[PDB]
Design a binder for this molecule. Structure first.
Ligand code: ATP
Ligand code: ATP
Ligand code: GAR
Ligand code: GAR
Ligand code: CL
Ligand code: CL
Ligand code: CL
Ligand code: CL
Ligand code: MG
Ligand code: MG
Ligand code: MG
Ligand code: MG
Ligand code: NA
Ligand code: NA
Lengths: 384, 386
């Protein structure tokens, strides 16, 4: 691995496709290595742009626009930070010689619930929920019958529950199908003891895992996350096995977020993000290398070696709901202290619910860490 | 404490005067809280400029130039990152309403050895080396004669060991003086034969004075080469060092993190000098603590309570200090410079013309000895080309 000096002719260039809080941390990690960072997003002054060398505002779903930006900057690494990008152009560009992290195919496959679910369930032969594909209210209708209730519905092009529907009732199918709007996937409910994110890094020295991350979701948003999630060694063994198979099948170097359901000693694969994952923001205080630092280490072709975990830790989001273009944060003095920090993203405005920052905490117990982080997030007064 | 959103009208604005590797991390910690950062230096594309919202290049020793940039950017905080700045202008501006971190008087006393040395020794009655000042060669010679051999001569305004000479005999007198003219008044100090030297990173904040665990360090050519933490000290030595550091910071005044350099002789502690801001040796804290010295400086100056500092165990830093001339530096063999419990930082400095600290290796281990070896070895593996 040879790195140039940012801004100099031999500079090593990284292009972020998506500049939110996740990309912000990736950017800092690149910067820490003198790596040149070009932050791209669909709006100006996105978090990652504040810490990048330069930025571009474009419609990332527009393949032609993406090719132009890429051609213009000639990056050595194309690092997707969100799902919503023109994966097809990534494939083409990769084919043209461009380095897409972890690989273009992994981006495409995971973007579509159909590709990924078939790969894992079928090809890889791993445990998943019961599933089905349909392409019409009729098909929806007949599928949802196949699944039965309880049951889940998601566009094959859904995120953060975007267009998802939890179906216990026949009445919903009015709502359901419309909300889903295209085409969809219908899954049969898993009753797990808990869910985890197994952050798995694929690098030159093989695949390494972070301690399991537990989390609480609410209204399609993670609220809190913690590490390490308590689970059996047997269960952990199984989870690791599932994660390795998945990451190796997707291919390429990077940090992946493997979503799994845990039922006693059994583990079931749900999905996977071929990039750093929100719940993993706890690693900003819980490990020597954050998931962001791990991603960069991996993609640059550098070895990981190991990952140190610093005891019970948690993250708790700062998720206000208001409309403003000049947000201020008061009472900060009561949101920081021993074993407690906060991050404020730099998002330019808000109009509805939006993740503007995160609280991070460590404690003697996971329960205590969660509380310290939750309390700290609650102390911040978000003004408009 | 209220913070705005960077780039927005109510933004909280921080101006760094000096944009080296130290300011770079201060900038990153500001950015992590959505603090708007303006990076100023004497050259373009300085490290902190890479991670700042806006940058400016001016003569920081020119008070009028300083006033123009501050007037232009209207920062809420002026955060000097180096000693060589127009400190009288900072006093002026502070009077005019600006918040200078930690305070303008602290910057003024420490930018010139005479201010701080006389304060510490004379006013605070802290233990220090013997010393004399001199502004002519003849007086310099009288000074050396009174001080005795060996002694160290240094320009009153200097850092990283520039213009200094370890004087062992009269034979060096002439070149030493000259050389102290390349890098004005000078200080002549008696040599303290210490067992080891430390940097006690001391944070003065809204919730009091807090101390990081002692950071040991090895200097060469008066420039740091390796640092580690914790440095073992007797209970008595640690208590004395803390007392000294507490006195210095409170005397200098204002919130911020200060790098208090001390010499240790068994259970006795002697004061050397202090940075009224993050310290180079303190870069070990990038791996060794929950909150790095940069994060602590920011926390403090923003008026937030520190609460406490967590130390992860034995760790060390080792500099990446090549020697060449180039304006297009590359770093190869990076795959042999990082791994388990091992990291590096490459600063983004635009060029080199001789020796220049371009990066740092960081490591953790079960002992500082092992940590130091791992960091040194990694720094060494880096293939610097240009
Ligand atoms: N078959 C299922 N059984 C039980 N719960 C499920 C199932 N499918 C999804 N969930 C629940 O829905 C949550 C979000 O749905 P899912 O992870 O499948 O996709 P998503 O909405 O696109 O989220 P993401 O933002 O991670 O892409 C999961 O974290 C889990 O709590
Ligand atoms: N009186 C003294 N006795 C013994 N050693 C000393 C004395 N003064 C300085 N040194 C040695 O030289 C090193 C550098 O000296 P000093 O800190 O004064 O220089 P500097 O140019 O101000 O460096 P910087 O500001 O970057 O720390 C010390 O850390 C110590 O190793
Ligand atoms: N759950 C996915 C996730 O956390 N994505 C993160 O949020 C950004 C968008 O935030 P925004 O919608 O507020 O602009 C993305 O850019 C990414 O950093
Ligand atoms: N002990 C002082 C010290 O470490 N100063 C650090 O070195 C920079 C200058 O480096 P440069 O000479 O390579 O430009 C300063 O800006 C500061 O960060
Ligand atoms: Cl592992
Ligand atoms: Cl300095
Ligand atoms: Cl960090
Ligand atoms: Cl190799
Ligand atoms: Mg998804
Ligand atoms: Mg999910
Ligand atoms: Mg000094
Ligand atoms: Mg010194
Ligand atoms: Na690749
Ligand atoms: Na002040």
């Amino acid at each position: 691995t040879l790195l140039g000096t940012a801004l100099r002719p031999a500079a090593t260039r990284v292009m972020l496709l998506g500049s939110g809080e996740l990309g912000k941390e990736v950017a800092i990690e690149c910067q820490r290595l003198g790596v040149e960072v070009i932050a791209v997003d669909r709006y100006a002054d996105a978090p990652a742009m504040h810490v990048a060398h330069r930025s571009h505002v474009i419609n990332m779903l527009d393949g032609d626009a993406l090719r132009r930006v890429v051609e213009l900057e000639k990056p050595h690494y194309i690092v997707p930070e969100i799902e919503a990008i023109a994966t097809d152009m990534l494939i083409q560009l990769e084919e043209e010689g461009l380095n897409v992290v972890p690989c273009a195919r992994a981006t495409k496959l995971t973007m579509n619930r159909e590709g990924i679910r078939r790969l894992a369930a079928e090809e890889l032969q791993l445990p998943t929920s019961t599933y089905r594909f349909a392409d019409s209210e009729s098909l929806f209708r007949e599928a949802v019958a196949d699944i039965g209730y309880p049951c889940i519905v998601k566009p094959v092009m859904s995120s953060s529950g975007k267009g998802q529907t939890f179906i216990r009732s026949a009445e919903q199918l009015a709502q359901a199908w419309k909300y889903a709007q295209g085409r969809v996937i219908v899954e049969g409910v898993v009753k797990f003891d808990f869910e985890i994110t197994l952050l798995t890094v694929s690098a030159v020295d093989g695949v390494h895992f972070c301690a399991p991350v537990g989390h609480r979701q609410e209204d399609g948003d993670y609220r809190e996350s913690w590490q390490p999630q308590q689970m059996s060694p047997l269960a952990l063994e199984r989870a690791q096995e599932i994660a390795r198979k998945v990451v190796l099948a997707l291919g390429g170097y990077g940090l992946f977020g493997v979503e799994l359901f845990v039922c006693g000693d059994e583990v079931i694969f749900s999905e996977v993000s071929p990039r750093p994952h929100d719940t993993g923001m706890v690693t900003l205080i819980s490990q020597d290398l954050s998931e962001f630092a791990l991603h960069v280490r991996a993609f640059l072709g550098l070895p990981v070696g190991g990952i140190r975990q610093y005891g019970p830790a948690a993250s708790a989001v700062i998720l206000p709901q208001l409309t403003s273009q000049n947000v201020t944060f008061d009472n900060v003095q009561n949101a920081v202290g021993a074993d407690l920090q906060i991050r404020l993203f730099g998002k330019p405005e808000i109009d509805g619910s939006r993740r503007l920052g995160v609280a991070l905490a460590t404690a003697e117990s996971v329960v205590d860490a969660i509380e310290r982080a939750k309390h700290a997030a609650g102390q911040v007064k978000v003004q408009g």
